[PDB]
């Protein structure tokens, strides 16, 4: 069921912002590992004395990487005279975030019709304000409320290219890498307690629970057209294997964003390209599932993928799950940084065509039991 | 003249340690951009609950990248019970260093006969102690004294592979990249005042002044065989163009390491390989000198390089300088991180064969006047 209860008009995911200590090195690593192009910048070369911010793009996906400069560069400025292109930025907040959590997502940004109204209605419905609405160059309005931990939900609205104060990057420095990644599919948070977190977020957004079909319980909030998907996990304590959610919470120093799922238009091409670069600066992937796994997929998705393609999943280590209206191809990276916290999922969805409706195939929770049983069968 | 006044036996540069906020992303970027292999690690997977440290190697060059974990992971430990593989490490020092300077070199490490004796003699001769000698696994001794700013000189001695507590990296994760870089040639510091800095360092090491042949005055300290070379710069104020040393000091929040010079066995191959990767995750280089420059090199080094090779310097943007016993090929990267502070030099030296003696060709200070005059001639 979809009651369409959004308390304000939401459009799509807009960008994800990482808070870093050195934006350059993280952005260059991500660009090479994921096949994203350098498209915009705001830094010393553009007059920004406060923070260095670099934008990577692939299809509709926008990754922003931001780090603070020395506060001494901007000590004469006041908020009305700031050279920061993102007015919510604060040196102390950013250094406290990175020293506390290490590399991670600070903002999940969604585009809305009216960011000032979204902020007002959100806070009137229980949202804890983070940064009030500010209008940038009479063109864009941005506002921020708390989502979970030190992660914020950022509203962006345009009257009528990223943000004012950002410059398009030189053609020479902008190499057109592309491994087929096209858009953000969902962004997932880990919290100690699921109930209060859902009640809080669903309370100020009006997002509804998206129904689906080990180590965690979770629930998915979705916007009216179910294109903005915000799952949340909590641990389950007292099992044989320690919950990966609890491990996250300890190493992250509390709640925060667990994974980003990026939609590919050709998950085979994406994973061939990413795996080619794993040991030369890119991303490592989860251990591949036992042979027994792929020996059972024919009996479960043999109607959607040919024998050639299931052996292509074989090589790349892709997992496949199936709901009632669609099928889901998915694979997970190892953690993106030093700590066992944030990672990335690559996905492709098959079915549910009207365009494709959101969440087609679910989030792969059937692969929990399938992988467990398959580990046992390979042992035998 | 070389008085050979070293107060203790010094061998060679051993490693350079960068203090980072995320060691993984910096190390992966550097490995791809410079062609260095992942050879050793100390982190959660090796039992280190304190810091993540990754070692890159190319020839004899060793780059170490270290970042702190959450202090909560090791809150029960005391120094006698520590799981840190580098006992000098301190969470607060590391976070204070990175928030103050951003990405930069924390330690310049040289191998000595006896690190405990080097420390004692150094401090008896004015060195400010940083970390007393500690013997690791009855096998290696390390000790640290202050060099300039928050950079330390690290003594390492072996009784008889990097350090105890580090593990060799898996063959699958260790891809054998190599662009021809072979060893560290010199490591250069920027200070506000040259006199007191030289007096301090020469005072506790016995290093002597290595003689050579705009915006700075500098001086080079050298060990007995002149294989450990430690230049130091200060600004010259009151010129037309603002001194790059003063710019460094402002953006770095004071003194620190300015550049690392890496010797290549084939600087043409190194720069073809590095420039191929500049826009796909590697390093950018200085703007190439005007055409008039290469139109004058035949008249100055035409005896050492052929017309084919001088036009090969043409393409790659290599500079060439010449002293009285040797010739120097050199080129500079853009800054390695967000701030206009640390950069890298690639060099190759020609001449002075007995093996090659150190400093053969100097440090390129003749290229200052040559580039100025060449900019004028291209304007004409
Ligand atoms: C190996 C191996 C591998 C897995 N494993 C996982 O850990 C695993 C962890 C996560 Cl966070 C997700 C996931 O994407 C998801 C959402 O986006 C929303 C609701 C919560 C949720 O689960 C899927 C996983 N899948 C499919 C999987 O197969 N297991 C259990 N063992
Ligand atoms: C363009 C352009 C380009 C340069 N330029 C520089 O900035 C420049 C800056 C430095 Cl720090 C060095 C250098 O390596 C060096 C030492 O290692 C020890 C003593 C101090 C010293 O100078 C060489 C440079 N060279 C050759 C050069 O050509 N100028 C002046 N203009
Ligand atoms: Co997911
Ligand atoms: Co130099």
Swiss-Prot record, chains A, B:
Q: What is its main location?
A: cytoplasm
* Cofactor binding description: Binds 1 Fe cation per subunit.
Summarize where Fe cation binds, as residue positions.
186, 259, 345
* Cofactor(s) needed: Fe cation
Described function = Catalyzes the conversion of 4-hydroxyphenylpyruvic acid to homogentisic acid, one of the steps in tyrosine catabolism.
Instruction: Report which gene this protein is encoded by.
Output: HPD
Record protein name field: 4-hydroxyphenylpyruvate dioxygenase
Q: Which family does it belong to?
A: Belongs to the 4HPPD family.
* EC number annotated for this UniProt entry: 1.13.11.27
